[PDB]
Write a protein that binds this ligand. Structure first.
Ligand SMILES: *[C@@H]1O[C@H](CO)[C@@H](O[C@@H]2O[C@H](CO)[C@@H](O[C@@H]3O[C@H](CO)[C@@H](O)[C@H](O)[C@@H]3O)[C@H](O)[C@H]2NC(C)=O)[C@H](O)[C@H]1NC(C)=O
Ligand SMILES: *[C@@H]1O[C@H](CO)[C@@H](O[C@@H]2O[C@H](CO)[C@@H](O)[C@H](O)[C@H]2NC(C)=O)[C@H](O)[C@H]1NC(C)=O
Lengths: 462, 124, 124, 51, 52
């Protein structure tokens, strides 16, 4: 028999390509107000249907690093946040001299914040009145290059102008579903042991992705998804000692955080009809902010991670260590929860090391004991470079507490020397793409090419 | 079986149930301008493919065999091994080189038969 | 008679002059982004209905009778009393429940015809 | 009286507050139905309806 | 500053008080401006007080 040309439409064929995925969220947020929360101010009500579908005979090379969804998530969150700061007050009257008092305590320890006064312009342009506010030290810098023990400045006003966060909006990470327009499909890996790049022998298709948490943290990956059956170590290239290595845990480690001080809300009219906020007197006794982690659980976590860091470094030691250094934003485990920006020192979480000896995990002497991380709090924040980089976070009155689950680590392997066999890992700060890359790893977008051509046994009946 | 439910099924088993994959190519929901872009882009893609099908004479689409003969230099492969036990997604990676050639012939053949649709009807 | 000029007329009298109502479904004139959204929404709606008609095999639309047999449990009403002296707007409030069932059958019947359009043409 | 509450704007001198009449109407695929019975209570059926 | 005989194409050296990073502290400063962009300020006679 002969063979001619025939055309089919509606064929399953794929090619991966760029596309802007639109954000969706569950319907309960869509009765809310403007800018509260961003998850509803710029998204659409999601639908659980259609449910996940599995492709019964497939092979597609997913890639966690050569991916463009994280780029879109970065761009969208920057633009969304920069839009969210527009209706807020911009604090330009606060670029004034601050005269501060020098209360002091000696012996033991103390955690004071300064009490600084400053002339303010009231509702009347040409009439002023004396005032005061309490500020944490990191946001206060001495003004004059000449010696003066009392005249200070806000750390801004040398760099760009600087804005207060609106009091009606929140930083709460409401989950987000990214999903594709018509003519595109989201392909989902479903093999639990997936290295991150290379083929998935089990591949699926979904309408909209699982709820991602736009949550910010540097050294510890907070509330999020958990691994399937074991810890997975994932890096773009493990022959490179500079690249960020992502460790995604199986079991979570619970962490509680608290600021015990019973702070007070103080308000200040600054110009016609807008109010600057500040902390008044501290009620009760002054105490230290901190976060607690159970010690045996951390030993178990770091030991299980050590078992898999030695799948690539078998003979050698793993030797965890302190952050390398740098500025306060680079070294600390910065996070926001409860509305106040914490910056916790992590040096006690990485003080010893699994030495190949997998020391016995049970029976624990006292599992209720914990290891405490001391923390410092800021009000002026530089969240990302260039996106209206200030946000003055208005203080929250009262004492606050926060409870969350650890789910992953960002680490880094230090530079070797002298052919050292005992080489060391460390916590790693990184760009936020690294943070979200731990969550969008499962997904890739494909275009549908529904037109195909084939040989067939029929001819057109002309 | 859903949207891509026949992906990986045999080309014979995947050549049916085409409508469920044809019915999904048109939809829409927007925030902002940059997703309205995607919406009109998808509408444009659908209309482009429909216009291409019409230019070949396969309007009222879905399956439509034709007259542009299968030159052996396009496949050089056996009919059973390509239809019974190959899949469309991996059939593309065997014929993707040569579709763009076939489309032009497949237009001019429509022209060549519509000429007869003109002439023979005029003479009758 | 205009746009909805046959609204309220008999189903027989309203089954004609369908073009004047089919011709008004496409138009546009916009200020701002929200009316542009309305415009593309209308275009999408028209294309969705056209694609649905094509999936049933009623391309070149307007009136198109079929094979999917009228199950008696859909109407149970006399032909004269429904065609001569009912109007379409209040016919919907007698059959609105059961159209969504009929559409899937009306797709798969077209599939079951396209199978023969393939097979019998191949054998000839 | 302001400056205790929000800041406050002068009306542009070129623009006017004159109520020029406005015609609202619908995009394609929608129709406007008009009641034409003069005694209409406001809600309930209109026996005379127009487009 | 002035020159006589021949020709001269000079531009003015004008000082002006400026608000620094601190709103309520100011410092003395100067810049050279071409004359077309510099106009005398007061309608009354003054040989030194100018405006943009
Ligand atoms: C931060 O510093 C400010 C001043 O720089 C402190 O506010 C001042 O507090 C004192 C003590 O209460 C006030 O003076 C008192 O006023 C009462 C009037 O009932 C009088 O009887 C006392 O003899 C005494 O003069 C003072 O008015 C007040 N200043 C202002 C501008 O309100 C503030 O307490 C300091 N806060 C901390 C946490 O150190
Ligand atoms: C402010 O501090 C008080 C006292 O430390 C907290 O009160 C305790 O809260 C825990 C839960 O976090 C309860 O189990 C206790 O029963 C509470 N009382 C005491 C005496 O401990 C209070 O929770 C803190 N505020 C916030 C917002 O966390």
């Amino acid at each position: 028999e002969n063979l001619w040309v025939t055309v089919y439409y509606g064929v399953p064929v794929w090619k991966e390509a760029k596309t802007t995925l639109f954000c969706a969220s569950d319907a309960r947020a869509y009765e809310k107000e403007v800018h509260n929360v961003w998850a509803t101010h710029a998204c659409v009500p999601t639908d659980p249907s259609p449910q996940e579908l599995v492709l019964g005979n497939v092979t597609e090379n997913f890639n966690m690093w050569k991916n463009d969804m994280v780029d879109q998530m970065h761009e969208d969150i920057i633009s969304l946040w920069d839009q969210s700061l527009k209706p807020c007050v911009k604090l330009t009257p606060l670029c004034v001299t601050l005269i501060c008092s020098n209360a002091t305590v000696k012996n033991g320890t103390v955690e004071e914040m300064k009490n600084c006064s400053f002339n303010t312009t009231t509702e009347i342009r040409d009439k002023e009145k004396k005032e005061y506010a309490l500020f944490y030290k990191p946001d206060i810098v001495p003004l004059s290059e000449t010696n003066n023990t009392s005249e200070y400045r806000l750390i801004n006003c040398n760099t760009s102008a600087c804005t207060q966060a609106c009091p009606k909006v929140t930083f709460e990470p409401i989950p987000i579903h990214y999903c594709a327009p018509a003519g595109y499909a989201i392909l989902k890996c479903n093999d639990e042991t997936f290295n991150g790049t290379g083929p998935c022998s089990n591949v699926s298709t979904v309408q909209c992705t699982h709820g991602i948490r736009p949550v910010v943290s540097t050294q510890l990956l907070l509330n999020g998804s958990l691994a399937e059956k074991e810890i997975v170590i994932r890096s773009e290239n493990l022959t490179n000692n500079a690249k960020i290595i992502i460790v995604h845990l199986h079991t979570p480690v619970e962490i509680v955080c608290t600021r015990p001080n019973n702070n007070t809300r103080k308000s200040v009219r600054i110009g016609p009809g807008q109010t600057f906020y500040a902390t008044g007197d501290i009620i009760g006794d002054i105490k230290q902010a901190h976060c607690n982690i159970s010690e045996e659980k951390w030993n178990d976590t770091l030991q299980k991670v050590g078992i898999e860091l030695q799948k690539h470094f078998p003979n050698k030691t793993i030797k965890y260590n302190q952050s390398a250094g740098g500025d306060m934003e680079i070294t600390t485990h910065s996070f926001n929860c409860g509305g106040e920006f914490f910056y916790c020192n992590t040096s006690n979480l990485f003080n010893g090391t699994y030495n190949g000896t997998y020391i016995s995990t049970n029976s624990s002497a006292n599992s209720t004991s914990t290891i405490t991380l001391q923390c410092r709090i800021k009000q002026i924040i530089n969240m990302w470079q260039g996106v209206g980089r200030c946000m003055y976070a208005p203080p929250i009155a009262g004492n606050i507490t926060c409870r969350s689950n650890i789910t992953g680590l960002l680490l880094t392997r230090d530079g070797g020397t002298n052919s050292n066999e005992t080489e060391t890992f460390r916590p790693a700060g990184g760009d936020m793409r690294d943070n979200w890359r731990s969550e969008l790893y499962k997904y890739k977008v494909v275009k549908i090419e529904p037109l195909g051509v084939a040989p067939t046994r029929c001819k057109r009946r002309v | 079986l859903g949207f891509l439910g026949a992906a990986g099924s045999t080309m014979g088993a995947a050549s049916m149930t085409l409508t469920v994959q044809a019915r999904n190519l048109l939809s829409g929901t927007v925030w902002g301008i940059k997703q309205l872009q995607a919406r009109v882009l998808a509408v444009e893609r659908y209309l482009r493919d429909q216009q291409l099908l019409g230019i070949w004479g396969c309007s009222g689409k879905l399956i439509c065999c034709t007259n542009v003969p299968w030159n052996s230099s396009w496949s050089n492969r056996n009919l059973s091994e390509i239809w019974d036990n190959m899949t469309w997604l991996q059939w593309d990676k065997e014929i993707s080189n040569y579709t763009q050639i076939i489309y032009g012939l497949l237009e001019e053949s429509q022209n060549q038969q519509e000429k007869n649709e003109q002439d023979l009807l005029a003479l009758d």
